Structures are given as structure tokens and as C-alpha cells.
Amino acid sequence: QELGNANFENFIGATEGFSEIAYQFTSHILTLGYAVMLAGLLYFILTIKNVDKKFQMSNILSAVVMVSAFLLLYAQAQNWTSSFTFNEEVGRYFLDPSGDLFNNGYRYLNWLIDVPMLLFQILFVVSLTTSKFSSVRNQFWFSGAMMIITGYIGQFYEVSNLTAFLVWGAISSAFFFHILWVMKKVINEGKEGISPAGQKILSNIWILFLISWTLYPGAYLMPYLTGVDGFLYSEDGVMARQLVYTIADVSSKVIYGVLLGNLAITLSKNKEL
Amino acid sequence: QELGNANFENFIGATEGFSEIAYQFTSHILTLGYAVMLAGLLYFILTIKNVDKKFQMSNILSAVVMVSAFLLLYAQAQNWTSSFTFNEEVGRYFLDPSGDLFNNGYRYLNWLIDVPMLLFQILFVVSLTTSKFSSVRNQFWFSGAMMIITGYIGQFYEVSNLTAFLVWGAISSAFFFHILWVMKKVINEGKEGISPAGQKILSNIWILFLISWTLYPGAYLMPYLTGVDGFLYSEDGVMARQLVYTIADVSSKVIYGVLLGNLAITLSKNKEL
Amino acid sequence: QELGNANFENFIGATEGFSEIAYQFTSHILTLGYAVMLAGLLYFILTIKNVDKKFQMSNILSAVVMVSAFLLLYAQAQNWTSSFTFNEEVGRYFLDPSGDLFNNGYRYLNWLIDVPMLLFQILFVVSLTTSKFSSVRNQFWFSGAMMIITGYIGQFYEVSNLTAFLVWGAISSAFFFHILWVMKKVINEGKEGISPAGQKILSNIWILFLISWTLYPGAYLMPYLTGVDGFLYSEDGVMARQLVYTIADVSSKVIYGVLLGNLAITLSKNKEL
Amino acid sequence: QELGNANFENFIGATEGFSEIAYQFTSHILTLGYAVMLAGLLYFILTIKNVDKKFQMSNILSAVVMVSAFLLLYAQAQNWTSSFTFNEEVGRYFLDPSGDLFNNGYRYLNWLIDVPMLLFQILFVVSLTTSKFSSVRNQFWFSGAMMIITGYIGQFYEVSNLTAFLVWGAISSAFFFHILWVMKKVINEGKEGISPAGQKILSNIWILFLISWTLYPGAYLMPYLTGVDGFLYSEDGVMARQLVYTIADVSSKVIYGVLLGNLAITLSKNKEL
Amino acid sequence: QELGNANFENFIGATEGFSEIAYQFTSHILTLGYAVMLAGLLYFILTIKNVDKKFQMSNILSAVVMSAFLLLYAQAQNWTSSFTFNEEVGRYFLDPSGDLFNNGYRYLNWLIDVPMLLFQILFVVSLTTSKFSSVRNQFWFSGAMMIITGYIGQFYEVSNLTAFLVWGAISSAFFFHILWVMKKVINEGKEGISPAGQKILSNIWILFLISWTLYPGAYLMPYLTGVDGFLYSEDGVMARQLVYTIADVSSKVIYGVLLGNLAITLSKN
């Protein structure tokens, strides 16, 4: 049938269908997703006053991101269950058109919140040295936006037009690398002046940042990571994608936020850990 | 098909239908909408005590507006997905009558909250000089109400009666210009007596106000901005409208509120931003 | 069609149906309704500590009422959209039986919360002189209950039995007049001892009270206010009713609560307006 | 129709059906139910600091109970509307199987929270004299549990097996009487040492306790209180049941909690009424 | 019918169906489940400042766990969606359009709960010989593996008894390790502290041991009376969800309460 510019999940769901395990796991992992976010929201709110006032905006922004992430992940969980329906006769879940096609694009647009805020918030914990606050912020926000928008466009074509898929992806990747560049600079400048304990944490933050953010373009490519008609162009690929997103989200948002708060505590004059 | 006094989205949806991208993007952008608002709610609550007590009503009113905006944008997101349903055979989303017709009128009525409050709240940060508090407030609230109500009437006719559409629109525009007038006065009087830092922020606030508020009549006209049977009288026009609304909403509510809070901080005796 | 003891909305919906504007406006105005209430909830919570401790129960009760009002108005909004469904062929919304008949009775029973609390709460701001606190409270609560319950019974018969409609209404009206009586007494005793500023506010409160509360029996009668087979026995009447309710609710609950809080501030030794 | 071990509501709904008034009132009263609970939640949270720290657990437990009650009453409201559907032809609501059968059992199991907590909480306001805290608590909790569980079993048979109905009921009643016994003891010991104002309140609390708690076994029996084929074995009986539950719930939870808080205030060294 | 790798609830629901009592009780007990969790959330938040600042992370983590609400709520809805009344025979049968019922929701949400529940005690007790990071890491790794292996197993609880039991066994191994470490922790926690505190830690260990053990009980539940036994039936379905609910309340709420009580005794102010 005629699906057009639609994510590959829909093509699997429309042809092969999803096994119990495939469908259920995807449902489960998305649910875990939004559960983590709302739990995180509570954590970040409840820990605000555990750091000096100047650092507390970081906590607040963590919270802001959690709200966004919860809402989107919740929506997406529902979208998954609405989009695919059990067929008694063969014992598989198939595309149910009246539920809408499943799209990952929900995620992408909500990054327009998450990415800017996640990048922003570290600038409230670390002091810069050579770099200007406004400069770093602006470069983060611009590169962040362009990364997301270009990617957002790409992913519509992940089946219908492999070329546009890869080209927009490439453009997106460029802006990604810039963000990586700037974050490294920031982290290095942040290390200057501060205790070895704080430096250790920033080291961890950078590792976490690097891995977790890289997962996202991984999820982009996931269906094609074993070439055409590979292992991953299948329900297994579908599962892998949503797993990676969920891991990425938890890491890039919650764990990131926790580490930052820990850093804030070491840099806090009153407070110990 | 007989649609009557209904928004043009429904006419597109009933005849041509919406592509995957058109339907999905509109869904996505509305979702981002309400997500931003709930995130904002948390921000404004959590930052109340970042300014002197006298300023804190501004924070509170920001929060009040966020609640309104969230609820409306959430409803509207749902209305969009209910109103248009996938057709397997042609691969487009078509008007589903049993979901109700899509109307933008939800937005308009909720402005009866937002507009009065957004105008009101600045009067808790800036001091007036030559203008009287109650006078400015009353002119804001009256002109605000009339602007919205006249617009609300107009938009019902955006297809069924181009003339009424444009006339009510024109009347609405008059009240808009008055509001612009008064806000300018307010901004200028607010600048007097206060630090250059604060003056800079009020300058930004005015620009933001001017652009963001102007977008709304833009969205009004959107379908017709390329004349009859133009580019924009189409799913592309539908997309444009909801994008512009979302940008307008984020700008006019969240960013506006942030800047005001920043101003409040500079004007705060204790706090040194 | 066999509807029985049902509100007149259902008879309109079942015979003539509702135009786009009629259906949509009613939907919109009910939505505004509950949006205002949740916004109000936030306001009243966030402003508690803006008055002396002794006054703060008034804020708390405002909040309590908002919760009630939100829940009910939300339910009612949903009930409206569920009860009436678009017919493609004629382009009007008709009674959809599977959604339940629309009833205003939801509102009535929730007044069993709102009315007692709204009457109660003023007694925490004003001092009485000659009257006893418990006496005024008991008279409010008894008369309030009887007013609502008798009205609640009446409105079931607003179509099926004009006689019972008017008789129960009349009985209800009696208790209403008593409440008006007592509130006047309270307002007068409240004015004694206190600044001209406070007296002004109580004057406004009384006007607001008188008008807003009177709207409710107006809504009761609405369908018949232009006699049999009049303008108002129609979708226009339906619209009028729900508009009036929404205006009444906002006025009698939110604005009322705001004014009371303003009064509390003037009567607060520490706090200024 | 084959209904089995089902509540009598379903038998009425399946045979006679429910009139507009019967269906609507039941819907309305259940809605009022959960509305009161959520309002109560807000009240109890907002008033925590109105008593000395030692008393504040009582407030907290009130809040705990409200959350439980809200959730259950909300669910139950939805269950009612899902279980019974309008039939255009005769103008009555009939059992809709696809909505599930209506069961009161939701209520019963949620008492496993409410009852233990309601009994517990008074022990944080009153001082015992002869009786030990842990002893009273344990007897409350055991007797409470057994009361509920035995009742829960009974009510499944309220139609299918009048004998089991009455026997399990009887067993339940035994545990009830014990609870009554212990609460009386507690109330009497609580009166010793404390002001006449406090004693008055505890007297009221005992009356409230006795009446409100007794309503619950009343609701149990309701359908049969006028014998076989009586007034009450009918939609009128259905209405009566849910009314009584709602009155019982408001009384046993909210009003009870309010009185306790009032008592706490009199017993507070810092605070006056 | 063709159900595949699906939980046994679905096989009961598809063949025999569920009586009013079976269906309703399961609905009721799951509802109680999530109600308790939301109530608990409020309790733990409202009691944070009842202990010294250093202990307050334990309260916060209790709150975080009260995850449980969201999952139990979802699961309640899943139950009612998955099984629909048949008027003709008066039983509830599998309704395919609602999805098959899976317990897997629970399992994956443990990936939150278990790590946090294990973690949080380390904010109340002082260790002696053991290192904080060491205990944490062993908890978190063993916790994850326990859940993941179990999660895989339960898919096969009907379709493949062998895989069911094998993955279960592997899971059990990691469980025993967690038990081991928790015991160590409890013992080290007792050292140096008041008799009041020691008493509470004793209770905590008992509660931990019983409540956590219930979970593998629920795993096996359908087969605890052998093939075609009492429990391979709607009665078994009921038993499972009851045990989960008891386990959840115990392992989360009561656990959290006791910990807070311990925190209070150890509090100087």
C-alpha cells in the first residue's frame, strides 16, 4: 500500500508485522522512557536547594527538560500502541491506519527544547575563561537548531528517498561536530580553577556527553547499519532504534543533569558530598 | 460536501487531503507548543524568589498564562489528530467528520486570558511616570478584549465569506494598533530612572512584543497571503499557520516572560544577575 | 425521539442540530471556563503569603473552589463534544445518543462545594460586629444547599414539565433571596472599622456578588426568556446559557476571590497596595 | 442475559434500564465525590503548618487518604458512564457489556488504604491514658482489614447468593463493632486532660464517626432494605446507594479530617482558632 | 488461536475466559496498586524535612520510586483493555484489539525501582569494611541482569517452558548475589548505632527478604501446582497480580517508611 514519506517502522508493520516480543518490548521501553523522565523531574525539583543559589538555574533547567521529555515520550508511547494492532489469525501486530502512521518526528521537534537547554545549563555551573558566555550560548543554540531541523527533514525520507536521507543527515552531522567542538572547549575552561574532584566530574560529563549524543545519529541510521536488506531492516531494527533513543535520552538528560548537580555541589562553598 | 462557516484546514482536508509531512509536522509543532508551555510553567514557578517581592506578581502571571496556554495547545493538538484520518488507498489524511471540524477558535478564546495578563504583568515590573496605572490597565483590557472578540468572529468566515473575514479583521487591527501605542508609552516610561542594563532589556522586550504579536494577524491572513488559489491556499498554508502560531506563542509568552523576569532582577536591590 | 426529563440542548440537538458556530463556540467557551479555573488555582496558591496569616484561609478556600470548578467544567466540556456529532450531509452537529444526553446537572451538584465555600470564605477577611460567625455560616450553608438541590430538581423538567420547572425554581429563588439578605448584612458589618480603601473594595464585592449570582437563575430560565418559540428556544439560547454560566463562574469565583485577597491586603498591617 | 456474581446495578441496567434522572444523578453524585476529594487534598496540604509539628502527621494522612479517594472515585465515575449506554428508542440507559459490568468492589479494596489511615491518624492528635498506641493501632488495622476483605467477598454475591451475602456481611459487621468499641475508648481517653473546646470537638468527631461509618453497611444492604421486590430494588435503590457512599465518603474522610485539624489547633501551644 | 510468545493470562482469557470475580478482582487489585503508590509519593515528599539533611536523599529516592504509579496505572488500563465481557456466556475473553496483556511493563520499570531501592539505604546506614561505590556497582549490575534475564524468560512462560526455567535460573543467581550484598550492608549498618536503629534494620532485612522473594514466586505462579494444576487458571492469574501488588507495597512503600524511621533515630536534630 501507499505510505509515502513515512518512517520504516510503518513499512515493517504494514508488510511483515511485529511479533509479540517486538511490539511489546517497543511499548515497554518507551514507557520506561517517560517514567524515568517524570521521576527525574521530581529528583531535580527536590534537590534544588542542595547547591548554592548561583548554581540553582542548572537544577531548574534539568527540571524543564524532564517536563518536555516526559510529555513527548508519553505521546510517543501512545502513538506506538495506536499505530499497530493485533491480528488474531497470524498472531502479529500490523499497521492500523486509523491510528496515524508512527513517526519519530515528535522526538526531533521536542529536541528544539531539550538540546538548547542541556547545552545552556552547564554554563551556569562552570566558569568560562577565554570564551564569552553569550558567544558559546549563541553557537550552541544556532548549531543545535540547525542540527535538529536538518535531521528532522532527513528522517521523513529514510525509506522514500535514501539520498535526501543521507544528505540532510550529513548536513546535520556537520552542526553536531561543531557542538561537540564547543562543548569540549567549555569543559576544558570549566576545569581551570576548580578542585580535582570537580575536574574528575567534568571529565565524566564529557565522556557521557560524547557517547550519549552520538547514539542519536546511530538511531537515525539504525535501519541501514547492516546495509540494505540486513539484520536491522526488520522488527529487530525497530526495537534497536527505540532502545537506543531511550538509553540516549536517560543518559543525555537525567544522568547528565545528575553529574552537573554533583559538580555544582563540589563548587558550592557551604555544601559537601 | 457542506462545511459551512469552518476554517480552511477543513476544506483542504476534505478535498486534497494532507500528505504525511503536512499532517505529521502540524501534529509535531502543536505538541512542541504545549510542551514548551508546561516547561515554562515550571520555570516561572521555580524562579519566583529570584526577584524582590514587589516584582513577584509578574512571575505569578507568567505562570498563570502558561497554564492557560498548555491546556489550550494540548486540546488543539488532540483536535488536529481527531479531525483528520489516514486513507490507506491514496496515502493521505482526510477530514474525519466524527472527530469534529478543526477550528482555530479554541486559541482565540484562550487569548481572553493570555492577552489581558501579558499586558497587565509588565505593570508590576516597570514604574509608570506620566501614565496612570488603572488607565493603562483598562485600555489594555478593553482593547485586548475587543481585538480578540472581533477576530474570533472574523475567522469563522475565512472561507465562507471573504468580506466579513476582512472587515472584522480590520476592526480587530484597529484595537491592535491602540495596544501597540500604549505598550510603547509604557516601555518608554519604564526606561526612565533605571539602569542602562534594564533599559537594554526593555528595548528587546519592545522588539519581541512588536514582532511576536504581529505574527498573529499574519496567521489570520495566512491562507490568502499569496492571493486566491496561491501557494498558501493549501496544506503548505495550513503548516505555515500553525508554525507561526507556535512561534508567536513561545515568543509572546515564554520569552516575553523570561525577559521581564530578567528586568525584575536588574531592578532588584539584592540581586546582581 | 424519546428523551424524557432532559435539558433543552438535547431537543435542539436532536431536531434542528447545531451549526458549526453554535457547536464550536459552546465548545470554546466551556474550554475557556475550565482553563480560567486552573489558572486561578495557581494564582490563589501562589499569592497565599501576600496577606497576614489570619486571612490566608480565604486564599486556601479560593484554591479549593478552583479545583472543584476546573474538574466540573472540564467534565462538562467533554460531555458537550461527546453528546453532539457532525453530520456530513447537512453540515450540522446532531445528538449522538451513545455519548449520553447533555445535562447541566453536573454544574449544579458541584455548587454544593462552591457556594458554601464562597460564602464561608469572606468571613475570614471581614470582621462581623453584631452578627455571630457560626450563625451567618449556618444560614449561608443551609440556604445554599436548599437553593442548589431545589434548582437541581427543577432543571430536569425544563422541557418535560414547565410547571415543576417554575415551581422548584421559585422555591430555589426564595433561598437565594435569603442568601442575598445575609451577604448584605455581612458586607455592611465588614465595612465598619476599616479604611475607605477597604470599604470601596467591599462595595465592589457586593455589586459583583449581586450581578454574578443573579446570572445563574438567568441561565436557568434562558430558553424561555423570549417566551415559547422565541429567539432563545434555539441554538442561540444554548450558546447564551453556557456563555452566561462561564461569565457567572469567572465572576463569582475568580474575580470574587481576587477582590477578597485585595481586601485582605489592605487589612494586612505589613502589606500595601 | 448471563451476569453471574455481579452487583445489582447491572441487573437493573440489563432488564429495566435507567431513566435519564437515575443515570445522570448517579453520574453527577460520583463526580461530586472525586471533586470533593481533590479539593480536600489541596486543603489538607495547604493547612499542614496551621498546627504544631507533632500534629502535622494527621494532616499528612488526611492528604494521603484524599489521593486514594480521588483516584478510586474518579475511576468509579468513569466505570458508571462506560457500563450503561442510552437507547434512543425507549429513552433509557441499558447495560453496555463492552464497558465491563459495574462493580462497587473498586471502593472496597481502596478502603484497605483509607480505613487503616483514618483510624491511625487520630492517634497523632489525642493522647491515650490507659491504652497503648501500638496496641490500638494494631487492633484497628487488623479489624479494619478483616472488615473490608469479608465485605468485599460478600458484595459479589449480593444477587447471585443472598445467603453468602448476609453471612460474610455478618462476619464483617462483627469486626466493625470491635472498631466502634476501640474508637469510643480512644475518644474518651482523648477527652481527658484537654480543654472543654477540644472535648466538644471530640464529641462531634465521635458522632460523625458513628453515623458516617454506619452508612457503609447501609449501602451494602441498600437494595434489600425494603425487602424483596421493594421500592429500593430498582434504579431508586441504585441512586440511594451511590448517594449514601458519597455522603459517607465526604463525612468519614474530609469532615472527619477537618475536625481533627481543628482539634489539633486547640491542642497547639502556638496556635489559636 | 495464535498467540505466540505471550503471557499465560492471554491463554486463559482466550480459551476459558475470566469469571466476573476473576476479572474484577484483578482490576481492583491493580487499581489499589497504583493508588498506594501515589499516596506514598505524597507521604514521602511531605515527610522529607522530618530527618537530617544528609538522610533526605533517601526520602527523595522513595518519592522517585513511587515510577511505580505510572507503571501500575498503565498495567491496570492494559488489563481492562485486553479482556472484554461476552454477554452470551457471562465471562471476559481476550479482546485482540486491546493488545495482549503482558507483565513485561512491570519488569522494565524495575530497571528504575530496583537500582534506586538498593541505592537509597546507602544514604542512611554507614558501611564499615565495604566501599560505597563497590556496593552500589554490584547492586546496579546484578539488579540489571536479574531484571533483563527475567524479562526475557517471562515471554516464554507458555511457549517454551525450557527457556522460561533457564533464564529464570540465571535471574535467580543474580538475585542471590543481591541478597548476599544487602545482608552485608545491613550488618555493617548495625555496627556503631543505637539498639533502636539495629531493631529497625533487622525488620528491614526481614521485609526485604520476604517481599523480594515474592517476585520470583509470581514468575512461577502458573506452574506452582504443576502442569494443569489449581493455579494454571484464572485463580493463578489472580494470585500472580495479588502477589505483585503485595510485593510492590512491601518492597517500596513499607521499605521506604522503615528507612525514614531509621533516618529519624540516626538524626541528631
Ligand SMILES: *C/C=C(C)/C=C/C=C(C)/C=C/C1=C(C)CCCC1(C)C
Ligand atoms: C535530549 C535529546 C538530545 C540530547 C538529542 C540529541 C540529538 C542529536 C545529537 C541528533 C543528531 C542528529 C545527527 C547528528 C544526524 C542525524 C540527525 C540527528 C538530528 C538525529
Ligand SMILES: *C/C=C(C)/C=C/C=C(C)/C=C/C1=C(C)CCCC1(C)C
Ligand atoms: C499569547 C497570545 C497572544 C499574545 C495573542 C495575540 C493575538 C493577537 C495580537 C491577535 C490579533 C488579531 C488581529 C490584530 C487581526 C486578526 C484577528 C486577531 C485577533 C488574530
Ligand SMILES: *C/C=C(C)/C=C/C=C(C)/C=C/C1=C(C)CCCC1(C)C
Ligand atoms: C460558583 C457557583 C455559584 C456561585 C453558583 C450559584 C448558583 C445560584 C445562585 C443558583 C441559583 C438558582 C436559582 C436562584 C433559581 C434556579 C435554580 C438555581 C440553583 C440556578
Ligand SMILES: *C/C=C(C)/C=C/C=C(C)/C=C/C1=C(C)CCCC1(C)C
Ligand atoms: C473512607 C472509607 C470508609 C471510612 C469505609 C468504611 C467502610 C465500612 C465501615 C464497611 C463496613 C462493612 C460492613 C460493616 C458490613 C458490610 C461490608 C462493609 C465492608 C461495607
Ligand SMILES: *C/C=C(C)/C=C/C=C(C)/C=C/C1=C(C)CCCC1(C)C
Ligand atoms: C519494586 C520492585 C521490585 C523490588 C522488584 C523486584 C524483582 C525481583 C526481585 C525479580 C526477581 C526475579 C527472579 C529472581 C527470577 C524470575 C525473574 C524475576 C526478575 C522476577
Ligand code: NA
Ligand atoms: Na496496539
Ligand code: NA
Ligand atoms: Na488522525
Ligand code: NA
Ligand atoms: Na463532537
Ligand code: NA
Ligand atoms: Na454512557
Ligand code: NA
Ligand atoms: Na474490559
